[PDB]
């Protein structure tokens, strides 16, 4: 239940379509009490599966609205 980091690069498109390379740094940890469920639903290697989806989607989301 200790903590663990992650980074996600994205070739996002700024508002003017400038394809900007932007990387985001994101931390995480699993909650102690609900480690049971987090293991049923994913398994031992839970974080590697989940970490980057939200980050890449949201780098695209945010930078689309923002200029290079």
């Amino acid at each position: 239940c200790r903590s663990r980091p992650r980074n996600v690069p994205v070739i996002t498109g700024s508002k003017d379509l400038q394809n900007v390379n932007i990387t985001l740094r994101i931390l995480f940890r699993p909650v102690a009490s609900q480690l049971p469920r987090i293991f049923t639903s994913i398994g031992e290697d839970y974080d590697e599966r989940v970490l980057p989806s939200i980050t890449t989607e949201i780098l695209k989301s945010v930078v689309a609205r923002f200029d290079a």
């Binding site: 996002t12 498109g13 700024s14 379509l17 989806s53 695209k60 689309a64």
Partner: protein
């Protein structure tokens, strides 16, 4: 172009569509990622060429201004 920019909801829609297409194979899903979106070469080269013209004709404006200094020095 909007596949790049609007990728937030593009990914949301792809998530919904794959979730509805993939529920049939006796497996349980939690999250899915759409990471990359790239194009071959020409977009970035054209963007940089537009910036080339921008700053190059700014340099031409400064050649023009040294030509002004020329008017007078040569007067």
């Amino acid at each position: 172009s909007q596949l790049i920019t609007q990728r937030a909801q593009v990914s949301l829609l792809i998530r919904r569509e794959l979730t509805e297409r993939a529920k049939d194979f006796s497996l349980i899903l939690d999250d899915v990622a759409i990471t990359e979106l790239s194009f071959s070469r020409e977009y970035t080269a054209a963007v940089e060429a537009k910036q080339v013209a921008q700053q190059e004709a700014q340099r031409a404006q400064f050649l023009v201004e040294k030509a002004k200094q020329e008017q007078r020095q040569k007067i």
